[PDB]
């Protein structure tokens, strides 16, 4: 009943030849509720994302 | 722009190859195809220039007693790319004056660092494992490298790795030392001594061993760049015990030959010392006692070890020694 992916013989990573994980990322533009844009490095392929529900419109983060 | 100037600053602080310098300032990989293939990282130029400017400024700021001054100089220089290039990518052993001056403090410092990184450690290990130190001379604190060579016999060129086995052929004639000093010491007034001792020759009376002094130089003058102790330099007045080769008796273990280097005690000119060349017993010899007598401070050491072989008889004959004893194969 245990559903698994039965492993292959893994690859031997020699000592000294281990290369660190540098995942492919993009410099994404994040637009908040208001006009404030903020840059973040993200792994998903998209240049721009505007947001509807954010901290800037939520009453908990701002009593104005 | 202090690193561009070369009035007071020695000429060694620059890269002597012009092309390389040019490349650095705005390559070396010889083959054309390979060069074509090569692709350097972007924006290296401007950023590099900025870095250079920063470091140059720092150096200038730094620029202004002797040891302190030397230290300051070293601090000022180290980050110079040119100096780094010179040190890293040119040979430190058989040094070439203009590329790397050990007169220059920065280079000296770098050399010391390099030594600390590996060779020194190796030497220490060899001393400890083979029981060179506690057996002959209580301890040492590295200070200066000491590389030996046996050029005359055979004729080949090789720096001996510490704790090697040398054939009787190889160690038939005397060795050459290169005592690479660091640590801002005086050069005119400072003299050195060098002793090749072997502590494990069979004492039949006690049943233990006794230590023989197989080669002894005293009152040697050294220089930071010029430090090869060849028969050119020392003269026959400086030899206290002239070279005797390793001639291990059959089944007398592996005899450890451990070359010690000491610096003289310092009081106007070069201070010498007599050492009653005749009186000093070389066949059985107390190193510690000797040191105590003349107040030496062992700076550096090196070591090799010899075993019996077919060749040793011939060597003995050449040197005009006895035929050599033979011992039972059992450690009874």
């Amino acid at each position: 009943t245990r559903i698994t992916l039965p492993r292959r013989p893994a690859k031997k990573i020699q000592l000294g030849k281990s290369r660190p994980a540098i995942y492919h990322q993009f410099n994404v533009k994040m637009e908040l509720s208001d006009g404030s844009v903020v840059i973040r490095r993200s792994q998903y392929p998209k240049g721009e994302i505007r947001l509807i529900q954010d901290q800037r419109n939520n009453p908990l983060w701002n009593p104005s | 722009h202090i690193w561009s100037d070369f009035t007071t600053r020695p000429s060694s602080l620059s890269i002597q190859s012009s092309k390389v310098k040019n490349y650095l300032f705005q390559p070396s990989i010889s083959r054309r195809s390979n060069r074509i293939k090569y692709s350097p990282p972007e924006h290296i130029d401007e950023i590099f220039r900025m870095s250079y400017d920063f470091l140059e400024q720092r150096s200038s700021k730094f620029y202004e007693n002797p040891l302190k001054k030397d230290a300051l100089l070293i601090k000022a220089e180290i980050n110079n790319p040119e100096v780094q290039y010179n040190f890293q990518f040119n040979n430190k052993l058989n040094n070439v004056k203009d590329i790397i001056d050990y007169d220059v403090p920065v280079y000296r410092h770098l050399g010391k660092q390099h030594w600390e990184s590996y060779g020194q450690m190796l030497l220490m290990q060899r001393l400890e494992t083979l029981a060179a130190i506690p057996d002959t001379l209580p301890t040492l604190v590295p200070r200066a490298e000491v590389n030996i060579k046996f050029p005359f016999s055979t004729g080949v060129n090789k720096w001996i790795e510490p704790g090697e086995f040398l054939s009787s052929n190889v160690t038939s004639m005397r060795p050459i030392f290169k005592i690479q000093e660091y640590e801002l010491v005086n050069v005119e007034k400072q003299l050195y001594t060098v002793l090749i001792v072997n502590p494990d020759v069979p004492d039949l009376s006690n049943d233990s061993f006794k230590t023989a002094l197989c080669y002894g130089l005293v009152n040697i003058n050294l220089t930071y760049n010029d430090n090869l102790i060849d028969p050119r330099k020392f003269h026959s007045s400086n030899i206290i015990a002239d070279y005797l080769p390793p001639v291990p008796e059959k089944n007398a273990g592996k005899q450890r030959f451990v070359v010690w280097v000491f610096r003289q005690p310092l009081i106007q000119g070069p201070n010498m010392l007599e050492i009653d060349r005749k009186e000093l017993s070389r066949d059985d010899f107390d190193i510690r006692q000797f040191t105590k007598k003349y107040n030496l401070t062992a700076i550096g050491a090196h070591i090799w070890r010899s075993e019996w072989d077919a060749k040793v008889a011939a060597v003995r004959e050449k040197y005009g020694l006895p035929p050599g004893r033979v011992f039972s194969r059992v450690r009874r």
Binding site: I22, V37 | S39
Partner: protein, 174 residues
């Protein structure tokens, strides 16, 4: 240069319209063919990328245009304005030499200070703490909207005596 390949096969499907569109933007790497000279090394391509070199990837619905980071510059005048140097820490300063809002014993000190300044406008501040600094000075942070003057840490040096600046230099951050 060192990044991994972009694994398009996961994000985009192998028969989708979006995927197709994405593909259309991208240009592939020059593959290898037996019989040709490649003088820049042979193309070591794996998973749709030349390993040799760096690899890049082109890309209400609306293009996100950022707001300008220089309104103060545009103004070129308003030293009594908050929307001035946006990416710099500002400090309130008042005229009489001229200096920080001095105000001259039943109440706690910070609270008293807060009260005093609250009256001059009608603004909304927050005291960081009751603990004072320096000669007794309080710190506080603004959140709402003789001279009402706002300045950066460098600008203040020109607008104030040297000794005074020295006394309170380490307070004014960058």
């Amino acid at each position: 240069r060192l990044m991994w390949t972009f694994p398009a096969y996961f994000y985009f499907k192998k028969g989708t319209v979006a995927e197709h569109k994405f593909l259309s933007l991208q240009k592939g790497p020059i593959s290898k063919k037996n019989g040709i000279w490649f003088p820049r090394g042979i193309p070591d391509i794996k998973h749709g990328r030349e390993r040799s070199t760096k690899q890049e990837v082109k890309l209400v619905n609306r293009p996100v245009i950022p707001n300008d980071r220089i309104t103060e510059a545009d103004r070129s005048n308003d030293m009594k304005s908050l929307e001035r140097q946006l990416s710099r820490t500002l400090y309130l300063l008042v005229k009489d030499t001229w200096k920080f809002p001095n105000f001259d014993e039943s109440k706690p000190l910070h609270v008293h200070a807060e009260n005093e300044l609250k009256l001059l406008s009608g603004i909304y501040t927050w005291s960081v703490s009751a603990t004072p600094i320096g000669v007794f000075i309080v710190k506080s942070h603004i959140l709402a909207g003789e001279d009402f003057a706002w300045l950066t840490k460098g600008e203040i040096s020109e607008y104030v005596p040297k000794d005074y600046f020295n006394k309170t230099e380490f307070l004014l951050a960058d």
